[PDB]
């Protein structure tokens, strides 16, 4: 299509700290690619982000009811919806599967990369360390960062640059909220 | 910390909006406009929770309203297209002849309109596939996920084919074992 496009995008946000002790609610409105007007719980009133949203910041902020309702969203909207989502979202935990393979580096004793594949886990907080004979490799780590699979799982790869020589043992050590003691997979040359 | 976002949008002249809930960057559910019903991202989400679909179709109608308002108010400024970044990968490391899934990750784009297509060995695969609605990003843009369940093999190659207005030609992203 050759025609132009016009995009209205309202976003209602709930931000939670210390579980649910501190909540912050934002009602944000985006015309095409700019934010026009916003409500911020920590501010207490609507506030025009750009010129386009001044007519509205001004009208709201005048109706006691619009403001009352807004200010009372941390309770009637955010906290309540936490109460629901909590079981299968905040408390959702899924343990990672952890492979250690070399990255097509079949050579006997040249430069290689050791892949620590870590897939299928939730939430996203995870830590992946490499150990050579019980000592923690801290240099030469080519990570992919977190990778949201979009199905409520993640994956990640941390690759170790090494020249393997017979008798060396590399260990990949994965920590994640879904397991008590760290998960490990080793690799021997 | 955690974030729950109720994300709606409405797009003209296409007359198509979306209503969804988003937790730490994953879709909790969306509302199927066509069928006016709730759609959970994972079926067992339906077992702990519920949502009345009508109330969303109201919010969209109000969003249609405010779009036309804010469009007039803006002297009919249109949106700058932002072509997507595309990436193909698999949800778990590959093991030949053992089922897996190809993930097409369309990121960092707007407006929320693309055409995605899976091509096994050049032909389009229309069976087995699923997609996610446009997930909000923080920078006012969108991300989307297309899924092809597939059987890894040395005799097969695949491409994800994305078509966006901010793109010159269609974008092919390639994947083959090795």
């Amino acid at each position: 299509d050759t025609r132009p496009r016009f995009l209205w995008q309202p976003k209602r946000e709930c931000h939670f700290f210390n579980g649910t002790e501190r909540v912050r609610f934002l009602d944000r409105y985006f015309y095409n690619q700019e934010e026009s007007v916003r409500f911020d719980s920590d501010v207490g009133e609507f506030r025009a982000v750009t010129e386009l949203g001044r007519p509205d910041a001004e009208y709201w902020n005048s109706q006691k009811d619009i403001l009352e309702q807004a200010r009372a969203a941390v309770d009637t909207y955010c906290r309540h919806n936490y109460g629901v989502g909590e079981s299968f979202t905040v408390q959702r935990r899924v343990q990672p599967k952890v492979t250690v393979y070399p990255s097509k580096t079949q050579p006997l004793q040249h430069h290689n990369l050791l892949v620590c594949s870590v897939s299928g886990f939730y939430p996203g907080s995870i830590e992946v360390r490499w150990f050579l004979n019980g000592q923690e490799e801290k240099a030469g780590m080519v990570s992919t960062g977190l990778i949201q699979n979009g199905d409520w799982t993640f994956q990640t790869l941390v690759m170790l640059e090494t020249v393997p020589r017979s008798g060396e043992v590399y260990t990949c050590q994965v920590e994640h909220p879904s397991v008590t003691s760290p998960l490990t997979v080793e690799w021997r040359a | 910390e955690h974030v729950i976002i109720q994300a709606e949008f409405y797009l003209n002249p296409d007359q198509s909006g979306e209503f969804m809930f988003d937790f730490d960057g994953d879709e909790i559910f969306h509302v199927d406009m066509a069928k006016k019903e709730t759609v959970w991202r994972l079926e067992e989400f339906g077992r702990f929770a519920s949502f009345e679909a009508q109330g969303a179709l109201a919010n969209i109608a109000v969003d249609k309203a405010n779009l036309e308002i804010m469009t007039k108010r803006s002297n009919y400024t249109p949106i700058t297209n932002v072509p997507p970044e595309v990436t193909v990968l698999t949800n778990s490391p590959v093991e030949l002849r053992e089922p897996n899934v190809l993930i097409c990750f369309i990121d960092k784009f707007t407006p929320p309109v693309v055409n995605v297509t899976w091509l096994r060995n050049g032909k389009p695969v229309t069976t087995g596939v699923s997609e996610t609605v446009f997930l909000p990003r923080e920078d006012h843009l969108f991300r989307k996920f297309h899924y092809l369940p597939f059987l890894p093999s040395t005799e097969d190659v695949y491409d994800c084919r994305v078509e966006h207005w901010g793109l010159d030609e269609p974008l092919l992203k390639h994947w083959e074992f090795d």
Binding site: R12, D27, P55, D56, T76 | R47, A49, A56
Partner: peptide, 14 residues
């Protein structure tokens, strides 16, 4: 078994 709350949002000025 539990119900989620949408937020009806505001009307822009016209």
């Amino acid at each position: 078994v539990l119900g989620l709350v949408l937020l009806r949002g505001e009307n822009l000025v016209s």
